[PDB]
Amino acid sequence: EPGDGAQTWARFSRPPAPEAAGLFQGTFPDGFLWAVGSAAYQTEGGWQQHGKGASIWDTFTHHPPATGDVASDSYNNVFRDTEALRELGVTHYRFSISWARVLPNGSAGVPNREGLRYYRRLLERLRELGVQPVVTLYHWDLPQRLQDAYGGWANRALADHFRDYAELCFRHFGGQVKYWITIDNPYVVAWHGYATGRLAPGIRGSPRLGYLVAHNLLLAHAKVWHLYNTSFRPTQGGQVSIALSSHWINPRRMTDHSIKECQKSLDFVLGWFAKPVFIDGDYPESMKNNLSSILPDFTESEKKFIKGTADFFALCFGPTLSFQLLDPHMKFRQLESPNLRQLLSWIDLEFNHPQIFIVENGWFVSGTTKRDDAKYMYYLKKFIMETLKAIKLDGVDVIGYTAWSLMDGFEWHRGYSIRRGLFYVDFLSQDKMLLPKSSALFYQKLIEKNGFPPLPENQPLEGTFPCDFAWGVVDNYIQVDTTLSQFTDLNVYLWDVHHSKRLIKVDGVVTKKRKSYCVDFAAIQPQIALLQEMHVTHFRFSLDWALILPLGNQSQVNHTILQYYRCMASELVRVNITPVVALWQPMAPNQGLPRLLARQGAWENPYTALAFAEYARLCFQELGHHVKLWITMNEPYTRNMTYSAGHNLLKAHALAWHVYNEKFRHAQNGKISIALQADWIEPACPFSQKDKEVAERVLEFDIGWLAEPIFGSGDYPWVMRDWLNQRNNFLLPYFTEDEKKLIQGTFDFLALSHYTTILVDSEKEDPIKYNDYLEVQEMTDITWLNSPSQVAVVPWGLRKVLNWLKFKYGDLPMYIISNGIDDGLHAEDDQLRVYYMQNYINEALKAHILDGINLCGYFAYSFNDRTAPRFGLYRYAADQFEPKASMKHYRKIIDSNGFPGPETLERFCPEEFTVCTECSF
Amino acid sequence: YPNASPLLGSSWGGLIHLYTATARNSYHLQIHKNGHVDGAPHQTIYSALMIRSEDAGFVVITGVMSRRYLCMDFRGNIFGSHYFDPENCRFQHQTLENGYDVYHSPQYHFLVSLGRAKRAFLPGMNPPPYSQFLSRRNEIPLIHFNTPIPRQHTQSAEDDSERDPLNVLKPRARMTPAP
Amino acid sequence: RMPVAPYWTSPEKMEKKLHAVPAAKTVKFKCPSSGTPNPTLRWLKNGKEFKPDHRIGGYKVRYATWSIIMDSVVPSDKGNYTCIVENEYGSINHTYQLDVVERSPHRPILQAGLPANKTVALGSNVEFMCKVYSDPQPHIQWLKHIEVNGSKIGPDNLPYVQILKTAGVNTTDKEMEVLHLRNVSFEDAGEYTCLAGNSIGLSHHSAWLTVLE
Amino acid sequence: RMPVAPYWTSPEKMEKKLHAVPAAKTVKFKCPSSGTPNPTLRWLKNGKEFKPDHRIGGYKVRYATWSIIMDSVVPSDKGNYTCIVENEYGSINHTYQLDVVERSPHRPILQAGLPANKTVALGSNVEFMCKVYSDPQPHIQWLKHIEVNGSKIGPDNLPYVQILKTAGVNTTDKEMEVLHLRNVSFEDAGEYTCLAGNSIGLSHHSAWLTVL
Ligand SMILES: O=C(O)[C@@H]1O[C@@H](O[C@H]2[C@H](O)[C@@H](NS(=O)(=O)O)[C@@H](O)O[C@@H]2COS(=O)(=O)O)[C@H](OS(=O)(=O)O)[C@@H](O)[C@@H]1O[C@H]1O[C@H](COS(=O)(=O)O)[C@@H](O[C@@H]2O[C@@H](C(=O)O)[C@@H](O[C@H]3O[C@H](COS(=O)(=O)O)[C@@H](O[C@@H]4O[C@@H](C(=O)O)[C@@H](O[C@H]5O[C@H](COS(=O)(=O)O)[C@@H](O[C@@H]6O[C@@H](C(=O)O)[C@@H](O[C@H]7O[C@H](COS(=O)(=O)O)[C@@H](O)[C@H](O)[C@H]7NS(=O)(=O)O)[C@H](O)[C@H]6OS(=O)(=O)O)[C@H](O)[C@H]5NS(=O)(=O)O)[C@H](O)[C@H]4OS(=O)(=O)O)[C@H](O)[C@H]3NS(=O)(=O)O)[C@H](O)[C@H]2OS(=O)(=O)O)[C@H](O)[C@H]1NS(=O)(=O)O
Ligand SMILES: [Cu+2]
């Protein structure tokens, strides 16, 4: 009933659960209709073959040039269409009888038997393959004789002709066809046919003509449905509906004026035909309180005629109406959304829980796109996932899904600039073969799996990480506050105990200064108390090079900051929390450097490498008695640094590593390596070889650029050098033999920083987002859960990048040196952080146990929210630190040493057996 | 069974709200980010104060969401300030014989008030309205304090002729060279 | 005569949402009404109906001004008090909130035995501890009795002290609870005083640190 | 009309002079007269004219019944409140001695660590201190937890007292602080309390006792 759907934006304003509806999987119901769709003018071709009369699309596209005369040539190619239907595995084929082919001269005249036998041959092929037909009687291809003789749908005398034609179809094909659609998209027929001129006849009359044409469309659909219900539904038992296309709309801001404007938008676009047909025979009163002289009036005989006149709700939610042909005056200053789940809930509420056959759905790609459509495939995946969420999590009665455009064809106002096909059609070819796209293979494997079943590579693992696994947290910006809390006052005072306990200063008498300890630093012990609450084994932090040496060189060593760092380290060892310390990080004002070093080229200068070696020597001298696990560079931005900057950064890493290995390793017995950021790079199409080549290229330009000199062969990776040679980019520097033997082994472990995965595609979808340098379209799966800053939590990419680092560089010790997401609001993004940490630590456990890598640590990103805001495991508000729920869940992961299972007596480690630490040498 | 609450002392270091009242209307002293202090009838996050005594009996009132310091000018009108000015922005506290706190400046002598007629603390002689305070402890959770929380309505490609409304195409920023 | 539904005679006197008083005070809640006939008054504490045996001392419920007068208010009186005034032609209600705040205008009471006397080895770690219970905001100081110039005693009979630790506008309340002494020498041996003070007065607890070996 | 001194209008309602009133109560001194004609009412704080800002809280004068009302009375409000009613034919005086007896606006504050957890070395001369802060001298009960019901509280807060040492106004208040205890072996070793309570509330401090 009209008004039941206005609770939809309140139903979905609450955030969903990540652990429940974020890796929401499941299969579709049995008897779900997996369909693929087609039109007549879009695909058939043969615009005059075998005496087919002129449609109004053979006048709009012949100078009202990219016409639909020979579009996909499906009038002659019945066999390859049905072979694509068979290899797609689809359950139903929605196609459209064209009016002008089977009735060229009219119903006052004999039918054209060749077009009728084409549809008969197509239907008998569909019967051979066992696919069921869903047939649109009218898919915008009205004949030119009716437009010429009566003015088209502006006359109410075509409703008889549409009753006659459909009768012919009901007589000829109704024994095979059990699903009929009278008029596909009466919105755009009425509104861009006779009110905007953008579509089929191109009238550009007025909105008055559009509402009169919609009036006659509703009357003609009612006449055809009553013809079927009276004279064909007894013997045949099919179902007749009308394919209504809707947009989805969202408030500009969540006030009830905006919400009633959104309901007014959906009543003006979709309720225009779905309130007569499904509710009461008459238009929405939102339109009857708005344009009652422009909107024509229904006789109450025509209100009982056009009531209940569809057997199912047929929904079109694709790029036809949504974001393309939606009239902006019908948006009512709101924001349209491509949300099919909220729209299906709106259909379920507003129109009395109907059985919804989503009868056209998909997105598009460009016309320059061959068989690699990753954007179409991920829009189709998101759309099928939203219908599965509507069936499962909303109780919407979706009975079928139709992926639109089996093959590429005409696109009605967008010519051939747009491709919506599942099967690639070369329009310049002669055979016009249906080559399966990426979306065809995806949709075939999804029909075969009947949805999204739980994959065996995503189910959680039971097991424990080894003993001396490094459970750590990071804080890249430690709070360096060198204010001493005690023993700073050196004057001597007089304590009048009795008449007072006021304190009188003995002027001139100053005692001696006590030796400063690090109970004096008041900012240290709160942080360590929060770290002891976390139960972490390791705490990672960076030094500020611009604070130790504020002039670049050793002339002005600030021993106060260095004493603060040394006492942070030693008070962490005092409470059995091992400090991991980064020498340099780019997460800083000017590249993590002193301002004298930052103002001299700053990493292009090789003196920055020599000064980093000397600064690291100072840090190993001072703090090195307590820190036994060093990070040289803390995740350099490989996407935002020059090849010479990375060259001298590798040289600085090797010089600091050799300083530690020669001068400081035997004294202190610690380890030192570099931390590199290793986000996973996955091909967008899982069976495209070009996307695999592109994924390996982005992996060698991202990770392998700085990892291959250190962990690999000592040179830059051959993918990188070969890609830059073939594009005439000789800016990647060459290592001399001395430099190559200097950098080739400068690691004690692998420290990786992993947050997300990026999908990569070889095809240039649009050149604005395309990366012309690496020749890659970066993209994302939009069924993945995201953070408020839109980074995808996708946990198997941690396991995949650990396997890639083992494949590329060998069985090295690997520390996941940083891993976390961010927050945006009250408490629902820490459900996302609990989900993230649970599943990413489980995938690290999978990579350790099942894949056999030597994983030695996991470090949660951002200790607190004071230093790295919205990333922290400690909320920082009102100058207090409150533990979030991810703190407690991560502490439970630490204390269990992983995910142990039903029986657990798992220590088995005296005098530790595993070798990734400082052994007997 | 008895003694169901928290002692009678240990709770002086938490966030409080300075309730004050005259018998028609009741407020909490509220320090805004404007620097304008007023009265909120309920415990607002801008009325949560952190009172720290710098001397024995001389308190300093800050306000933790505003990050200000309750100071007082030369005529009695209190305000907020991001910088602690230790000669006017420090107040001598007293408890009256009825159980209410008063806070007066040591140099200007004026009582901290939320009313108009800002007078001076003479002991035992009828303090001005909204000047007798009472330290109500905090009932707001900490999550309600850090609330910029901006859900970023970015609206990529604001025109509704969009080719990518659901944002599949997600480019990462890089550095391309120029040989 | 007239079936007048009851109304507030003055909603100017009824906009005090929260009554936060010290304990042992008196609180009057008023909700003045009019109407034909005189609509009877009822009070509900925390939803349940408030009768004068639910509270020690009871209350005056005098209807000439439509007020409840609770004398000697106890911290077991907090919560909502709803005035519902009713007759056969209508009923209205108004909810007041009563907070009770216990007030201790005393010197800061220090925890007994803290800080305690400590004998310790050379170069060990000693943490002196004092808990301070003050209903006003106290100032805590950690002093050491200095005997450097001559004897312990100054010009008058007041001992020399040095402020080891003091509470400021940047010092957390937990930070002053404990004085830490790392690697104690023989010079770090003597009297350590936790001196707390508010506007009511000053209290102090002393302890002694002696170093063995 | 008639030059007669203004007389009082209370036969036995104007003879309570000594007002022993608890703190934070409301006092109301009325001196009701009928002038010949309309008289002059004035209130004095033992010698000076009592203007309303001489009381923390102020005071309300009611000319309809000639009554001063001082609500939330303080300990500093003691004195001689004087009502003088004049007219043209002489004047009439009256005094009211207000003596405010005071009470603490809190529970009894027990100093923490009193009493403390002991390690009683096999029947010592053990003593259990409890410092109590209260302006009215409170009721003191100890509640030695005995081994009945098993749990500490079962059916609503067991009355575990068996101690003849109670609170008393006549006996001295200093050495009812300590608990003189005898025969301390393993027949009584559990949880002790210090219940001190007054008109506002009860406060308890818990300590353990262990005989080896
Ligand atoms: O100016 C001003 O002020 C201000 O202004 C403004 O302001 C602000 C502003 O805004 C600005 N501007 S702009 O523009 O810029 O903005 C500026 O200006 O600034 C400002 C500020 O200010 S300031 O403050 O600062 O200055 C504003 O304005 S607006 O408007 O805007 O608002 C404001 O602010 C202001 O103002 C306002 O307000 C105010 C207030 O406010 S607040 O908030 O602050 O608060 C006000 O004011 C106030 O008030 C007034 C009035 O009200 O009036 C005044 O007053 C006072 O006084 C009066 C009186 O006078 S004479 O002279 O006449 O005397 C009062 O009145 C009263 O009231 C009431 C009371 O009481 O209270 C009442 O009474 C009733 O009730 C009772 C009850 O009680 S209970 O108990 O319940 O508690 C009763 O009584 C009772 O009862 C009896 C019987 O029943 O009887 C008895 O009893 C017993 O006994 C018997 C026997 O006896 S023989 O004697 O007879 O033998 C028997 O019978 C019985 O039974 C018994 N009972 S048992 O119990 O035993 O059973 C009892 O006892 C009793 O009780 S007791 O306790 O008492 O003892 C009675 O009765 C009744 N009565 S009847 O008759 O009625 O019924 C009444 O009503 C009355 O009385 S009478 O007598 O008169 O009638 C009052 O209260 C007072 N108040 S206070 O204050 O003190 O509190 C005043 O002056 C004022 O003050 S001030 O400061 O303010 O000034 C107003 O509203 C306004 N103003 S204007 O003018 O301005 O407007
Ligand atoms: Cu007291």
Ligand SMILES: [Zn+2]
């Ligand atoms: Zn691809």
